[PDB]
Amino acid sequence: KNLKGIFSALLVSFNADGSINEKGLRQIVRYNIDKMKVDGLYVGGSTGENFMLSTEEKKEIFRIAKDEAKDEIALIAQVGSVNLQEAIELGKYATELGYDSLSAVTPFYYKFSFPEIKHYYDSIIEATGNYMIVYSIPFLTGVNIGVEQFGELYKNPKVLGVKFTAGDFYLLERLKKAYPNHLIWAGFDEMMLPAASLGVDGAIGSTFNVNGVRARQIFELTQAGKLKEALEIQHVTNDLIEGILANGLYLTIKELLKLDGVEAGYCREPMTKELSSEKVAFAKELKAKYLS
Amino acid sequence: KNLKGIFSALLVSFNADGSINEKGLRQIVRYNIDKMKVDGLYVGGSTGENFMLSTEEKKEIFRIAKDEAKDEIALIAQVGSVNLQEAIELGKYATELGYDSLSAVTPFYYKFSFPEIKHYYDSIIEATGNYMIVYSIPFLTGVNIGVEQFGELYKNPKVLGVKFTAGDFYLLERLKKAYPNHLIWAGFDEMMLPAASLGVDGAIGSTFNVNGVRARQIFELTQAGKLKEALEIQHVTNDLIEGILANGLYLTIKELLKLDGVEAGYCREPMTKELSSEKVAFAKELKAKYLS
Amino acid sequence: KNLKGIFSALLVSFNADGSINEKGLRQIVRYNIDKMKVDGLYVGGSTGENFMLSTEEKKEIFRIAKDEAKDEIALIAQVGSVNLQEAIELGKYATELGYDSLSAVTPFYYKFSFPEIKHYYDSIIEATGNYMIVYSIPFLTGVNIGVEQFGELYKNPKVLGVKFTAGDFYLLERLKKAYPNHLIWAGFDEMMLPAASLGVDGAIGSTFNVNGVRARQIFELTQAGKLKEALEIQHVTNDLIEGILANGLYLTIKELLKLDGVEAGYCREPMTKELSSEKVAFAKELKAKYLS
Amino acid sequence: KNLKGIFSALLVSFNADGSINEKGLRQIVRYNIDKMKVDGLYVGGSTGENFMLSTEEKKEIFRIAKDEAKDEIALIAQVGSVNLQEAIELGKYATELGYDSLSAVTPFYYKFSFPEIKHYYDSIIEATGNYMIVYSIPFLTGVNIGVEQFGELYKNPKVLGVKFTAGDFYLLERLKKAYPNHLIWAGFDEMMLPAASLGVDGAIGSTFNVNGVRARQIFELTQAGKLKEALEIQHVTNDLIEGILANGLYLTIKELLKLDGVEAGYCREPMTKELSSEKVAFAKELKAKYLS
């Protein structure tokens, strides 16, 4: 199954007490597939509030997402953790469910050496037999991997490439030059145009949950060399993103889902659970200006 | 029970497969009480490899530590997590076991606002009824809290004070000036002396597992104003600490315990699980030079 | 005079004792005009080793460069300094010589407030009557300016826009969206393609002194939407740039000029004055692979 | 001449047009010697607004300060610069004037290598014959030097030691341990007591221009092991420093001088030249509360 193209980092619907809302999660899945027209979903990432949840809740989300999506789209499962044993258990579970690849954040909190990081990736690959996408988010992790270190990771033939979330476009270009057959997915929705200009293979993003029509246009127009039109759409996109960021990233994408009839629910504590009223009204203005 | 003074951040003995070795953990607890002469233990911290473990393994460690220590010393339970529900569970369990206070790292990975951080501490306190020590480790977390924000936290009368792990001695002074009745424990063993000189009430540290004799000397000498002698002992301490850092922090402490007949075991993956033989030889030298 | 397009940040030829070599400086100017075919020169920038020079040497350089260039190309004079009186004197001097615009790095070393920064720019403009390009280099200065702050600066109608040297392509897009009539010059040669893709009006770079042919191709092909060809040329460019960076930035561009008969001379202490022999040999290899 | 103890980093009196006010500079010098009772002055440092001035103005300040001080106190001349030639010129001039040591900030703006930094210090020393104090201000410079690199610097017997301005108390202890006969001056007035507790030999500070009496008490009491009394005075000191930082550092110290009849003048552009009237009223309050 082809892993190129547009992937929404799946948001999860929670109840007021923080439990999974299965019905709302299925609506979010459906909405991405049928209305956003994504190539795939990236499940259990930062956007899914993954790192605030129990092992059992993560399994529950993997199960529901796969069940609802079936085989209509590609699915990637993020299974990384500071706990390698949890990561292996999640990796085997997602592999058994039929996820097309695994993905794993570089281990965080502690300051791990590069050979520890490589051993972590190799252990998950070995225990699962599945493909791996290296998940690079230096602004959250403080972890910075170079071209040579990426080459050492790529010695494992099950490693397909990297979800690139740093804003280093020098490194991005260097990685594409050095490993032309390895894949890169851009992680930053608001920099999609420059990233596609350097030949990334795809994008994984939180805003595609509500703006997937514009995201695909930016990406495909860029790759066809229609820059003038891609740029205009990127501009409107970034007006939307700038508002969503100022209003509260995850809550505001959820409120934009709710405004389209999707039961996207609350956020999970310790994140703020629901918008204040004025921030509800602000989300409505964003809906009216950009998504109507 | 008095929470002032010298607290070892408890190391945990693991088997080759990463399971807890109960017999070893009990030897480590017994050695801190009987040989290091600590005032208490801080259990489930960074030092105990906490964030690489399952919830069940965390509970197991709390239980064992408490069972072995009984009521001879004070015990503090670190129950913080990106998962607030897990933090509440562990907080209730440790409270039922009779830990004298909880502690909790500020939630991490995601970028939480300060009112989220305050709500997180307030929720743990309300659900457990226990005391709370705010756990500040900016070099691992990327989280920086100010004097005013500490004031907001301290509006909850069950918040006793802070485990201070930043090296900002201006902030440390400002906090003691503003909240003279709240407690500060120094978190950096190699800066014990300047921290004690500013009136911190205790220290919580990984190296006190093998250097607890000198740590108590530095701390009590400094508070008595014997700076000349405190400094000499800090100098030797930091020769030892420099060596430990260079050889691998957790593994070298465990090697140093092993050399005194404590079965301190392996470290937990994804950390390197055991020292290479030259690193074992290096640890023997530190032993011969500083702890014989 | 039109300030769009390709500007080399002018390197300066120094003698062994650090004095300016006027014959060499003239050769570097002539080479840029006739062989690199640049639209202009940006004189007195970082690349010119400007900050290691006295006010007299700076004046000497402005006059030689203008005298040699005459009116064949556009010229911009970087006159910024921690000393505002020096910046004014240089700004008047360069204006009198007929430079087409001034430019000034944000004041550095001290932490200036934004209103101090704005006042600095307004003072230089008022004293000289000339146009001003805001010079933004956060990796050298530690200074970060936002979209709103750029808008306050742009209230002065003599401010033309900004030499952008941060790698923040979100900010770059947001600046183009907000102030569509103000100009942006990219400052990072190795990210020229992504920057052009977002509509920048030009580039100012150290490497255009030797690679100005490829630099113009990347820029013009990108603007025409020929991304596939622009990317190939950016790849080869970045092979050259990676080698130049590893070998020593300014020294290696000078050595690559020398290999084309230009007496680009020494660097100025406290920079290392000349390459070691092996680094000379390395620059020869770069010349053979990329510039023959 | 003995270079231990308490040094005010000397403020400079400017007129409304930025020229040096000689009469005012002399009043500041006199006030530090007679009223603050300092062991010496550190002239041409960050506090003296040095880096905003021309070479001639710097010379003028060295000459005036030395003339006014004569031989009553120790004098250190800061002569560092991104321009090594200006550094050598100023170093020779100050040496000829009879300054007891030079000092030079690590070269900044460009990212110099360590061998370049060492060659810079060695050149200044060789051209002047004078002593050198290495001036370490990482929060302004972005430059971080380690224990081994300080040892390489100290191979030059004319390098006396270091003005320490990082808040890294581990590095401070390590430097005293490794080079017990080399001197350290604390750079951070608000961290005086913990620095003195680690055996620093002296302190160089901006606030000693108005709080010299307290600064000497903190330092001498700490060295005598009267920590309880030292801490009280550090507390009051840091209430004053906090106010001064909030209100505007250099302008508020000058306002505090003016309230004692010292004509401390304006600040030099591009710093804000004078306080607003509410900030004047604020400074009067600091004077009433802490310096009456």
Swiss-Prot record, chains A, B, C, D:
One of its GO terms (cellular component) is cytosol. Its EC number is 4.1.3.3. Although equilibrium favors sialic acid cleavage, this enzyme could be used for high-yield chemoenzymatic synthesis of structurally diverse sialic acids in the presence of excess pyruvate. Engineering these enzymes to synthesize structurally modified natural sialic acids and their non-natural derivatives holds promise in creating novel therapeutic agents. This is N-acetylneuraminate lyase. Pfam families: DHDPS. SUPFAM superfamilies: Aldolase. GO terms for molecular function: N-acetylneuraminate lyase activity. Catalyzes the reversible aldol cleavage of N-acetylneuraminic acid (sialic acid; Neu5Ac) to form pyruvate and N-acetylmannosamine (ManNAc) via a Schiff base intermediate. Homotetramer. The keyword Cytoplasm applies. Keywords: Carbohydrate metabolism, Cytoplasm, Lyase, Schiff base. It comes from the Bacteria. Aceneuramate binds at S46, T47, Y135, T165, G187, D189, E190, S206, Y250. Pathway: Amino-sugar metabolism; N-acetylneuraminate degradation; D-fructose 6-phosphate from N-acetylneuraminate: step 1/5. It comes from Pasteurella multocida (strain Pm70).
